[PDB]
Amino acid sequence: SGAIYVGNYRVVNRHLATHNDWANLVWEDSSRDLLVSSTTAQGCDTIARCDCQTGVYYCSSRRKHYPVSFSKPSLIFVEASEYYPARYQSHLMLAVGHSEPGDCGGILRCQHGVVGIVSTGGNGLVGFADVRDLLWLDE
Ligand SMILES: NC(=O)[C@H]1CCC(=O)N(Cc2csc3ccccc23)C1
Numbered sequence: 001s002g003a004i005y006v007g008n009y010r011v012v013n014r015h016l017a018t019h020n021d022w023a024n025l026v027w028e029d030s031s032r033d034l035l036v037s038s039t040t041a042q043g044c045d046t047i048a049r050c051d052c053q054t055g056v057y058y059c060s061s062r063r064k065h066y067p068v069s070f071s072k073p074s075l076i077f078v079e080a081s082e083y084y085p086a087r088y089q090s091h092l093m094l095a096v097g098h099s100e101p102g103d104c105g106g107i108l109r110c111q112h113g114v115v116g117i118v119s120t121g122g123n124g125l126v127g128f129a130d131v132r133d134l135l136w137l138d139e
């Protein structure tokens with residue numbers, strides 16, 4: 001689990017969105033596994049605006065943060081799960097690192113701020129849904 005809180009927005013994995021997230025929907029994209037809902041409280045996270053390929057992510061299944069090198073956002077084939085059939089997920093970045101399904105939502109950060117959230121994984125890889133291109137999260 002995990003979310004990004006910026007301004008009057010809450011960014012979560014679309015497959016983990018709650019009833020309140022859907023009742024206050026701002027934007028969702030199944031191909032990216034992202035959903036953004038509105039909040040009454042003001043969020044303080046900073047979103048990165050950059051093309052970094054190194055950062056640190058939080059891994060809840062180890063209670064640890066790990067430093068990683070990751071690929072630029074791209075269209076990657078993702079195996080079926082209980083939430084989606086096998087499909088291409090867009091805006092996805094991969095790294096070599098540990099992840100389990102419950103790790104989804106953990107933040108990946110660089111020196112500029114929040115880069116994205118854990119969304120995919122398996123076989124010693126971890127994939128992150130990018131949020132750096134969502135310029136509207138700031139205004
Ligand atoms: N299509 C998606 O974005 C998600 C939907 C929900 C889901 O359980 N997964 C699989 C998954 C995510 S982290 C991880 C780590 C080790 C094994 C499996 C997984 C994919």
Ligand SMILES: [Zn+2]
Nearest residue numbers: 050052110112
């Ligand atoms: Zn950066």
